[model samples]
Target chain A: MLDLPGNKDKKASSKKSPAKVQSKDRDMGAALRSAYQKTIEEQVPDEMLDLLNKLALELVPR
Target chain B: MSLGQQLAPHLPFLRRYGRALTGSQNQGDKYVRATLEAIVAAPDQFPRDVDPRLGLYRMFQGIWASANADGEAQTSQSDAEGTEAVARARLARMTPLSRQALLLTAMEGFSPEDAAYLIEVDTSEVETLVTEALAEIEKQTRALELVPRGSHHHHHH
Candidate 1:
């Protein structure tokens, strides 16, 4: 390996801005996934359970 | 065979699918209600061969199909479709089979084969539907974020 003539040089500087807009980047999956997970985590409504129970138990007339 | 005991355990997750699909608890539950009503109308008519979960989702297709026909329908209540306004807006833009294909694979974890079985499409069709869905998701986000247009790579079949 041959040593470089000029010695140390600063590499691609830490100029990458985190907050400011990049040329090409965005996330779409997260929003949709959040929406879906929110629904999944919700407690089942009582009316639904009641409806299913009522329909399934039709043999037992009320 | 009657769902009876087998149906109870799957109902909650089924509710999840309904809510996610319709983007509203109100409409989703209503769809669920309609399917339940159909099942009760002739319990014996429900499929006997498939797994209870499969049969349940399969039954939902008919109800969803009819409602999705003649134009989309709406519920009386304004729902928590507010959870993801952008996603709800994008969802309104999806085709019937495309939405089902995306959800069955992406959310419900159904394999392409099974998703095809559920939605009555080819397995290859399911694969294509999923890819298109992801592409639309990305494309929509890019548009929203105002990403500069570029000749980007696309996956080839």
Candidate 2:
């Protein structure tokens, strides 16, 4: 019953060039960093920060 | 007496999901424990109004949000500049919702419905998110491959 929108556009655009893909990747990374920084600015706590750091180390390489 | 206690029986799955979320054993364990703690602290925060699976989904969101926050903090300590830098760069380039959906569905084996519930979106949105996340992962994997000294970039892409 969820009014789910179709994602055909993204599906169609999946074959982008490497440069374009890299650009997209960079954009995502920046967004994640911004989100993290914003959360820190909101005083998310040192313990939480430690957990995030641990998460990054574990999740990235995989 | 709490959902945490109920979830205790599913620790192995939690650990596996955490590993999938973090893509590393140590981090997965950390996330699993943190998720359990969160459940202990706020069992009611999980959406019992929906399917029990949705509760699991919400629980996962807590784990991811907390673990991601924790990961960002650790990026500052050592020579993780390279690792942190790469992850940040990837995170920026990829679409957030899509990446999350992809991981939840493909990597973690959540049904599309459950994925949408966790992400607070429509089930149809899960496909797009999964597709986009997979594309990004593929792109990143290739990029890592080009770098001779690859550092375990294996993932569900």
In the range A1-62, model 1's lDDT, one tens digit per residue, is: 67767667776986764432111122343444556676557555445445556665456556
**Could you give candidate 2's per-residue lDDT for residues B57-91 as a string of tens digits?**
56655767765576632321111344334444445
Off by over 4 Å in 2: A1-62, B1-5, B47-52, B67-99, B107-111, B133-157
Docking class of 1: incorrect
TM-score of each model's chain B? 0.70, 0.52
- The C-alpha stretches of model 1 lying farther than 4 A from their native spots are A1-34, A45-62, B1-4, B70-82, B90-92, B140-142, B145-157
Chain B TM, cand. 2: 0.52
* DockQ of every predicted complex: 0.11, 0.03
True contacts kept of 2: 0.00
